[PDB]
Amino acid sequence: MYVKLISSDGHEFIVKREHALTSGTIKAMLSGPGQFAENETNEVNFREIPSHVLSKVCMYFTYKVRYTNSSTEIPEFPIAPEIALELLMAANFLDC
Amino acid sequence: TSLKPRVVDFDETWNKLLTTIKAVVMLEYVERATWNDRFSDIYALCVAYPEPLGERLYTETKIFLENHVRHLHKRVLESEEQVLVMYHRYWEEYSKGADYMDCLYRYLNTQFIKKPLMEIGELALDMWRKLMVEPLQAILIRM
Amino acid sequence: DVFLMIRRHKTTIFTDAKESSTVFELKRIVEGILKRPPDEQRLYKDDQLLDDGKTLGECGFTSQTARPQAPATVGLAFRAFEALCIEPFSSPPELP
Amino acid sequence: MEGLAGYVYKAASEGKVLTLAALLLNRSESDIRYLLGYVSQQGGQRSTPLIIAARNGHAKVVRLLLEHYRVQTQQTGTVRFDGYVIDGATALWCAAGAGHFEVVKLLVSHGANVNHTTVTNSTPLRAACFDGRLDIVKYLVENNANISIANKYDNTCLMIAAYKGHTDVVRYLLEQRADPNAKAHCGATALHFAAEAGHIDIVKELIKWRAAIVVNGHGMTPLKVAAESCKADVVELLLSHADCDRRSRIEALELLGASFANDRENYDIIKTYHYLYLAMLERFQDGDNILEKEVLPPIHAYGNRTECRNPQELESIRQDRDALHMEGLIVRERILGADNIDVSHPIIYRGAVYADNMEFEQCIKLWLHALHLRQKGNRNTHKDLLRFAQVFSQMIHLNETVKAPDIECVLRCSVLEIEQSMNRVKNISDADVHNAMDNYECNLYTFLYLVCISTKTQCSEEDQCKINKQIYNLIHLDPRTREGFTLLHLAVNSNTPVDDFHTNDVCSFPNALVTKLLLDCGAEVNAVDNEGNSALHIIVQYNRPISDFLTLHSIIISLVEAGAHTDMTNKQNKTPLDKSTTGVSEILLKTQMKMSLKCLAARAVRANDINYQDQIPRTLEEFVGFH
Amino acid sequence: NQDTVIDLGISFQIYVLQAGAWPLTQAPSSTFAIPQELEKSVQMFELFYSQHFSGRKLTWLHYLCTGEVKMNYLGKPYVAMVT
């Protein structure tokens, strides 16, 4: 139900499995060998992306799950200028 | 240490990736940390700078798949006593390996292959058909 | 539909709940997904303690404050209660 | 001065003396020489003040200009305003073309330019012959000017005088030892070029001077050229030659009867039957040394007739008009061959007549044969495909069934003709590149009309597969108009022109069926034009969101489902949401938007102008480029 | 095909039909509250219809519709079909 996302800089992020399956690359990582079927950790080790971009993509996962289809009230995603151009490559890697 | 296009040596990363995909195709136990590291290596090789090693990676994967399918072909051809049992076991293993490898090669399929060539799982299935059951068509059908 | 970014050193959990609810089930679900004894949950909002029976809407965050696009941090230091040692996210590189 | 140049041009346009005296004096020498040696640009065309003096008949002003000053006649200017407007001509050329003898004689008397050669090396004798004034030609001949100056395509003055009512010029040429056997670019020895005009006296003069008979570049004797133009008098005169022989006489009479059957100006079916009867009677008159017909196999376009090898069947079909028309078409095709320029136009006229009487199937057969012949001849069939789209739209507007193989054939022909249109556009640098681009745009529009018609016609699975194959073949060339519009953009754009004929009743753009068919056939849905607008950028700009909302809804879904980006930007950095300019289109797009983190991150990168060169994967540099 | 197994707990057989074609009329306001047992089914179909048929709003008729009833408080006797 809950999967674990570990950044390169030691940081650990835990989000719901349905929330983290909206990105194709994490879905591929969870599938295949090493599923680690404890139904609680499913921990994936991201050896490249830093901690802040992983926090932002987890926030994006929750944001997209909440607003996958709603009314016109869709609030904008608060992307800082410093976190851009590093979240773009992160979304390219994750196929978000 | 970052998602930056960098000058990466093809030999070492391809050797590591070849070992991991051999373990995956043979359905042997592979560490999932190494599996995520091979996603990282796939991403690094797909958009490496200044040489976008996507054609090289695709050709090397095709060569490895051809070699693996030919080795299984030789084994199942010399095991004519239970060619069907061996073919069933090897088909289960190769189908699971092809699915898991298409999972591993998702970035290559979505960023170089389609956007023509064939997908890595599709290429694995095509190589299995063209070098595993096409030469063994007569024996498999008749037995 | 409140959204919380629970922090504990490096571990981070993204959780969805309601505005008018107790933190009892919040402690229970983080106990379930953390595999720890249920007596060490001491939630901290802006480095201060809060009541275990008071609703989390009045605890310091609400729908207008806590959003899926930008959840509010909640420290979850466990009793060995330990001091709040929430590791900050890695700073982005200095853009030109 | 440009203003002074305009002032002296207006002064010479009125043919005054004191105005030009005041406007060309009290100054230095260099500016005056520049003024008298420059052209003024009026109406987009450049002409000398001497040109406007000679054109309006004001020869007194140019005579006083030659008396007072030393103005030259070697100024470079245009030729005429009658659809030619090519430069390089001298002042004496247009002076001869103006039809005024006095200005020509005063220009000759001081600095004669009788031997002037333009870019087409056309002497003022060409303009004198075109105007038809005998005195100017006589003076030019007496001024020691060569009359054998042939053009790059060999347009001798005798031929260009023979093309119009200037038999006096041709005569004055031919009793001065003119060319008796000079060919041309198309091999016309002035007799192919004179019989089309039909001036019987000119042909009389040429026969009297023994102009002889020889086939042109298309393998046509001048007798056959006269027979093709439905002109009986020149046919008779060329027949009275004592060397034509019975075979050519019979085939010339038969071709004349054939041409009389299908022609706009000269249409007489009774003359058609009578000339065919005269040709047949001269064939079957002896029984010995007979001249049997080289009967071609029957062609499905002209029904299934097999000519008329007996007078009995010709008498049987005497009162049957459509059989006479098809017989004339068949024998005309046999005589003129299948690779002639003029063999296709009577077929087109017969098809138009058949379509006026709502006989659409035979019209389609005839026009398909004409299209096949013209494509074998490698000529511009942009007007013919428009006619096909018009007659197919009229069948739909009349609720008449349309044959799917006919649609497949015309679509394949349109695809091929668009291919040679692209080849012609690439090959031609600046000769007729505007006409080539107009033909290219017209061909793309006609292909769209044919596709829209094909979507509205019930077709079998194999026929639909063939139509989709032709569409796929055209899409893989990626055709683009002047403003970068791909074939998907025009089917999306509401500004795509529709022909004023029956295509308005069927081909209405935007059309969801055309867009869906193109996307199923593999259209580049993310392709942008020169301005950068994608296929989604133009559909949101539609100004009729509710009148045809069923069309607008069915096309936005198709583009997004095909894979068009709902967030990409043009060269002006405008999201289709921003360029939606309509609440309904914005609502539909926002309903069909599939949000992603990559689009948001790229939009944030582009908004903050972050330096993204060489910091991102090369497959993502384009992603930042349009997001 | 959803990412998670949606616990419908219901058999759903809606008859979706056009607005301007059918002569059905909701001129009275007819204020009605959907009960909680079928509250999940009505919400999932709104997500399904808006995903496959964009730009279509769905007003629900509450008088020309029926179905079986789950009477847990009644001891579940004699399963009935009511509006």
Question: 3-state secondary structure string, A30-80?
Answer: HCCCCCCCCCCCCCEECCCCCHHHHHHHHHHHHHHHHCCCCCCCCCCCCCC
Structure tokens at A51: 């901690």
Q: Are strands A12-16 and C11-17 parallel, antiparallel or unpaired?
A: parallel
Which residues touch D290 (CB under 8 Å, ≥6 apart)?
D283, D284
Neighbouring-strand partners of residue A5: A13, A44
Structure tokens at D131: 């105007």
Contacts of E51 in chain A (CB under 8 A): 69
Contacts of D619 in chain B (CB under 8 A): 47, 52, 111-112, 115
Per DSSP, which regions of B23-77 are E strands?
A: none
H-run or E-run covering E69: none
Domain boundaries, chain A: 17-93
Other CB atoms within 10 A of residue C70 CB: 15
Q: Give the integer Cα–Cα distance in Å for D375 and D338.
A: 11
- Exposed e or buried b for every residue in D270-303, given b needs 16+ CB within 10 A? ebbbebbbebbeebeeeeeeeeebeeeeebebbb
Contacts of E4 in chain A (CB under 8 A): 18
Chain D within 8 Å of A53 (Cβ-Cβ)? no
Q: Is the dihedral of CA D440, D446, D451, D454 positive or negative?
A: negative
Is residue D4 packed enough to be buried (19+ CB in 10 Å), middle (13-18) or exposed (0-12)? Answer: middle
Q: Give the integer Cα–Cα distance in Å for B42 and A92.
A: 13
Chain centroid to CA D43: how far?
A: 24
Residue C33: what are its φ and ψ, rounded to 5°?
-90, -5
Rg over CA atoms, chain C: 14
Neighbouring-strand partners of residue A6: A12, A45
Neighbouring-strand partners of residue C17: C2
Report the gap between the CA of B48 and the closest CA in chain D (Å).
Answer: 8
Chain B residues with at least one Cβ partner in A under 8 Å = 1-4, 24, 29-33, 35-37, 39-40, 43, 99-100, 103-104, 106-107, 110-111
Closest CA to D206 of D236, D181, D235, D187: D181
Residue from the list A32, A46, A89 with its beta carbon closest to the beta carbon of B104: A32
In the numeric block, the tokens 């004699």 are attached to: E78
Q: What is the DSSP letter of C42?
A: E
Structure tokens at B139: 């024996």
Q: Give the integer Cα–Cα distance in Å for C30 and C17.
A: 12
Contact B3 A8 (CB under 8 A): no
Structure tokens at D480: 């683009």
Cβ contact B20:B30 at 8 Å: yes
H-run or E-run covering D41: strand D40-42
Cβ contact D575:D569 at 8 Å: yes
Taking CA atoms, B1 is separated from A47, A85, C82, in Å, by 7, 16, 32
Chain E within 8 Å of A71 (Cβ-Cβ)? no
Report the gap between the CA of A18 and the closest CA in chain E (Å).
Answer: 6
H-run or E-run covering D405: helix D404-427
Among chain D residues, CA nearest to C69: D597
Per DSSP, which regions of D212-364 are E strands?
A: none
Chain A within 8 Å of E54 (Cβ-Cβ)? no
In the numeric block, the tokens 């000529």 are attached to: D379
Report the gap between the CA of D545 and the closest CA in chain A (Å).
Answer: 19
Cβ contact C44:C15 at 8 Å: no
Other CB atoms within 10 A of residue D337 CB: 13
In the numeric block, the tokens 């023979």 are attached to: D162
Taking CA atoms, A10 is separated from A85, C20, D474, in Å, by 22, 35, 55
Q: Is the dihedral of CA D496, D499, D500, D502 positive or negative?
A: negative
Cβ contact D478:D418 at 8 Å: no
Q: What is the DSSP letter of D534?
A: -
Q: Which of B21, B39, B46 best tests the A interface by mutation, with the highest count of A CBs <10 A? A: B39
Closest CA to B96 of B20, B34, B27: B27
Q: Give the integer Cα–Cα distance in Å for A91 and D620.
A: 11
Cβ contact D591:E55 at 8 Å: yes
Report the gap between the CA of B29 and the closest CA in chain A (Å).
Answer: 8
Omega before A81 within 30 of 0, i.e. cis: no
Way it was determined: cryo-EM
Cβ contact D257:D279 at 8 Å: yes
Structure tokens at C4: 């919380």
Q: Give the integer Cα–Cα distance in Å for D526 and D625.
A: 13
Residue from the list D597, D608, D617 with its beta carbon closest to the beta carbon of A57: D597
Q: Give the integer Cα–Cα distance in Å for D483 and D531.
A: 7
Fold of A17-93: Potassium Channel Kv1.1; Chain A (3.30.710)
Among chain E residues, CA nearest to A27: E3
Q: Which of E18, E54, E57 best tests the D interface by mutation, with the highest count of D CBs <10 A? A: E54
Cβ contact D488:D524 at 8 Å: yes
Is residue B108 packed enough to be buried (19+ CB in 10 Å), middle (13-18) or exposed (0-12)? Answer: buried
Chain centroid to CA D388: how far?
A: 17
Q: Give the integer Cα–Cα distance in Å for D302 and D354.
A: 12
Q: What is the DSSP letter of D377?
A: T
Q: Give the integer Cα–Cα distance in Å for B5 and D613.
A: 11
Omega before B50 within 30 of 0, i.e. cis: yes
Closest CA to C8 of C44, C37, C33: C44
Closest CA to D266 of D235, D239, D237: D235
Q: Give the integer Cα–Cα distance in Å for E67 and E15.
A: 13
H-run or E-run covering B56: helix B55-78
Chain E within 8 Å of A72 (Cβ-Cβ)? no
Contact E50 D588 (CB under 8 A): no
